[PDB]
Amino acid sequence: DQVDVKDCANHEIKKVLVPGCHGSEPCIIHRGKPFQLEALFEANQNSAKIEIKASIDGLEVDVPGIDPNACHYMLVKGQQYDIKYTWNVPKIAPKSENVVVTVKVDNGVLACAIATHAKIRD
């Protein structure tokens, strides 16, 4: 159930799980249905607002309906923390086979990742 992302910042993230998806192969996001991802990280700060970019064939969109508190789903330097996060995809969301999802989070950024194998369908 682990999938391949890419660390934009300093390697704070160790892994990314998505129910149903495996590695770098097509990860299907069903419109009108919840989308669940489990992330764990070791951030290098003491302290958290969540910011999600997502491009859909190069329509670059900030995601609506994002609960942006990290401590509503979950911290100090030099230790791990686990987060199991759900975004509900609007039924009307555009379909695409070329999607890039970008997620990142007191004095700068905590963690960052880029996933390129999501496909929006149904």
């Epitope: 249905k33 919840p34 609007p90 379909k95």
Partner: antibody, heavy 121, light 112 residues
Framework: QIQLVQSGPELKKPGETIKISCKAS????????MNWVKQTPGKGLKWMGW?????????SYADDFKGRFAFSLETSANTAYLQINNLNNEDMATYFC?????????????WGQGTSVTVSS | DIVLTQSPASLAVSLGQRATISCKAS??????????VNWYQQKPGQPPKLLIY???NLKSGIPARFSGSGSGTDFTLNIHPVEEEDAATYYC?????????FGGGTKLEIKR
Amino acid sequence: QIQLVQSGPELKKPGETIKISCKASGYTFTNYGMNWVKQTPGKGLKWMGWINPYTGEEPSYADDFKGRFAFSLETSANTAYLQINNLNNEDMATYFCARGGFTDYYGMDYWGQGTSVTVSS
Amino acid sequence: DIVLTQSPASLAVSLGQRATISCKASQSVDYGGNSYVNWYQQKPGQPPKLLIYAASNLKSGIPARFSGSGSGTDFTLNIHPVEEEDAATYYCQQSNEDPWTFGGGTKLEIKR
């Protein structure tokens, strides 16, 4: 104040076309899918498919309504349409438009009053 | 096609008593923590009206006399206490995958 109002009942002859309308109001039209639903007096409810006003994409049809049926929009007028071509006796039914929930969790929450179509010479 | 079978097809219940309507799906309607079955009420000459969404959520403005439960392939609508205005036909319906399907329905008769 959310409402879906359909065009009135209609007698059509076998072979003719009908364009049934479904005007929406009281919500942001482009944020919700519009589903079509067929009911025949004898029988129950059959989901025909749906159209997406956010994307303007090609509509999705259930197997029994591929080819003779066309869902369409006039988005500036908050209006969804169901055109049925080459009408036959089996098309004689009541057709409902129904708004899809913002996500699938919320069900088809608001329904038109229906449009009873009679097919007869 | 997900087939939805209602049991019973028809039911006669006295005022103040319980009406129990089962809906059986031919495969699971669960996805991502939710169960995608909704319950509708249709009175003669009228459009279906949604009572319950995602198996167990009571739609606003519907009294708590109506009660939805279940997950997976087995769903239940309970109406308790039954009242005169409940004379109608009730449909379950699944939004798990295309094509969305309705059950054949249950006609509720009020015993007097």
